[PDB]
Amino acid sequence: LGGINHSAVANRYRNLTKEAQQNLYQFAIIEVLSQIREERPDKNLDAYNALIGKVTTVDIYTYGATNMFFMPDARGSKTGILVNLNSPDKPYTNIQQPSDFNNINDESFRQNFTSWEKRDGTGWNLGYFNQKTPRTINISELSKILVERLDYHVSQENNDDQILSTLLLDVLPRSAKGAAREPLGVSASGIPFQLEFTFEGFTSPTDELRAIQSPFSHLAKYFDLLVASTNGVEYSQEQAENIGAWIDSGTQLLMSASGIGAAVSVIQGAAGLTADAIEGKEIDPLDVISLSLAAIPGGKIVAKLSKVSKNLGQVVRGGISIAETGVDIVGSSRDLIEGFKKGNFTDIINGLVSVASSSASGRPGKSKIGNAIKKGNPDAPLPTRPTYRNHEGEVRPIPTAQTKSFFERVAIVRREGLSGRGAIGLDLTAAQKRGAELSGMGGTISKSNPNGNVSQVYINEAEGIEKNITYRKVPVPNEPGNFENRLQESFLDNNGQTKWRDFPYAGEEFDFRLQHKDDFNNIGDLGVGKQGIIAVNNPYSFVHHSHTFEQKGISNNHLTLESNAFLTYIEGKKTGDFENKYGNEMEWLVRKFKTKKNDFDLKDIPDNIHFRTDREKGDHSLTTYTLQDFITVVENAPTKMRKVKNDEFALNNIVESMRATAKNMGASPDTLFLDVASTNYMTQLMGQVLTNGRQELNLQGLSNAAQKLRNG
Ligand SMILES: [Mg+2]
């Protein structure tokens, strides 16, 4: 499945400067001279030295023949050595007598002649070289003449790309070998010892051409070096989406990055996805594709293929791109299949999976990903990035396919998969949803669900299983008398009795909480004198609303900000590395919902902070500072909060939680005012969050800061 992409080979060669092409031929010659030298007794370095810049003179005969020349054994001699730089097996032949020319008949010689010229050899052979008298040049002029001969040969023929790739098949690996012999590195623009290069890892000549656009192509590395020898960059979202490098397949594979053997599943899933695309003829063997492995919030990874936009320009080389969210493996589809067969992507995919493993954000960051890749190989460079040539001839790295919209697309597909649950959904009133009703949240009230919290169908995308989840009030399994809230799944035992169990691990509760991020439960109490505490599922929520049920309606309705939970989380996120500071972030957020206000790592704020509307305030005095002012500043993440903004997923959910909570209590951020009694708590909190406690803030300063943000 494939053959050689001749234009990809030919493009690499054609886009070299003339100087770099001469150098390529020069290194090929050097390789063949080394072979001649070692295989002969005297060990003369004349040709070697007269070529490698000694001022002794060495005669060469040139021919109307590509890749070929003669090294006479003496001035004007008809005997010596015939060189064919493109011959698999006879790169040099000793010509001791005329008849030696007659015995040369292989296609690797015949190919070096144009269609027009090929007839000269008659049963084809080089016997006719005996009647011709070639011109003599000094050897220092040879690589130039060979370059000009190849250009002419290509111009004499109609099939430019194929003739070019054929005529270079065996020249290129010899050139690469010649370059690896260059002591202490190849020169860059007249400066010696600049460019390290080894021949190790090269496959057969044909396989190197087959793999020219593959991620670790050795020949692409050699071409890149030749470009660097003669002279000699990171993207933003607008530039990327303006470049439009990648076209979605429209199909994706969502997998878990956690659990033992997750990495094996990801590798197999990704190789599987590539194999299916080739069979279904969505993708051709030689098409350049980006296999994206992108982390997804909740410790998941999506594999998704993209085909390169033909609008982009020429693809120069495949490679590995590292995004903040994952890696892309770029090469021809056939290169990716072969690479999977060989295990070439295993260190990369192991590294990525280990850091996506239990990521709340699906955003381990470029540095963590890069480090995890280099872990499976002491401390090497980062893998070479794929590159393309734009319309004006500039070679640039290809942007990642893991753009903003890419993830929007991923989210759409997932949500279409989630559209068949809950036979008939319950038809609840706004008052029931606000938790204002004595009858409960709309579920059926029972002993272990006294609040009547509504059951929810959790679709476990991994297990392919549906679970029914209710936020229930259960005994604190030790101390009698007190109860706590827990999300639990119901199931039938052997006898048809309904039993209940916890989420087995934080990851699953986290995913449930995201999937049902908009729903509220009463985690407080229910009855006439009692405090209902109404809280959204969103795992990034640091607020809730609450009230006391009256004989009719409610009273003391207010929004509460969870000061220390918020403080601790933000201080953690402020470091830029939450995991380093506190645990697994996913575990931290799930655990937050079970933790009381004064039981977080930070306990600095003496109480929770309260906002209420003017009309509902009762006898609470209000400030003119609004939840909206708070949200505006939080959303902007200024000054010491700046790094929180690196995790947009977390920050958007924090804000959206706040807005949903304001709305659900029948209010809005601009109609919710901070209690006078919360003043000091708020200024202390923001002072710390925004300035590390270096600046004393007041509410007016906080309101003005919000005002400044809306003005811009
Ligand atoms: Mg032509």
Residue numbers in the entry: 17 to 69, 72 to 140, 158 to 267, 273 to 752
Paper text:
Combining experimental infection, cellular, and structural biology data, we demonstrated that nigritoxin is a potent toxin with lethal effect for crustaceans and insects. Nigritoxin is comprised of three domains, with the N-terminal domain being essential for cellular translocation and likely encoding specificity for Tetraconata, and the C-terminal domain being involved in cell death induction through apoptotic mechanisms. Typical signs of apoptosis were also observed in hemocytes of nigritoxin-injected shrimp and mimic cytopathological symptoms observed in animal infected by V. nigripulchritudo. This suggests that nigritoxin is a major virulence factor of V. nigripulchritudo and the hemocyte its primary target. Nigritoxin not only possesses a new protein fold but also seems to act by an original mechanism leading to apoptotic cell death.
The crystal structure of the nigritoxin was solved by the single anomalous diffusion (SAD) method, using a selenomethionine-labeled protein and refined at 2.1 Å resolution. The overall structural topology of nigritoxin is divided into three globular domains: a N-terminal (aa 17–268), a central (aa 276–460), and C-terminal domain (aa 495–753). A surface loop in the N-terminal domain contains a metal ion that was modeled as Mg2+, since this ion is present in the crystallization conditions. However, treatment of Sf9 cells with the chelating agent EDTA did not substantially alter the cytotoxic effect induced by nigritoxin, suggesting that the role of Mg2+ coordination is structural and not important for the activity. The C-terminal domain of nigritoxin contains two interesting and not yet described structural features: residues 512–544 form two large loops, each composed of two antiparallel strands that project out of the globular surface like “rabbit ears”. The bases of these protruding loops appear to be stabilized through a hydrophobic stacking of the side chain of Arg512 with the side chain of Trp540. The second feature is located on the concave side of the second, larger β-sheet, where four histidine residues and one arginine are concentrated in a groove with maximal distance of 10 Å creating a large and positively charged patch at the protein surface that has yet to have a defined biological function. Comparative analyses with Blast against PDB, DALI, Phyre2, or ProFunc revealed that neither the structure of full-length nigritoxin nor that of its individual subdomains resembles any known fold or protein structure, meaning that to date this protein structure is an “orphan”, making the identification of an active site difficult. On the other hand, deletion of the protruding loops eliminated toxicity, as did replacement with alanine of two histidine residues (His598 and His650) that are suspected of contributing to a functional “hotspot”.
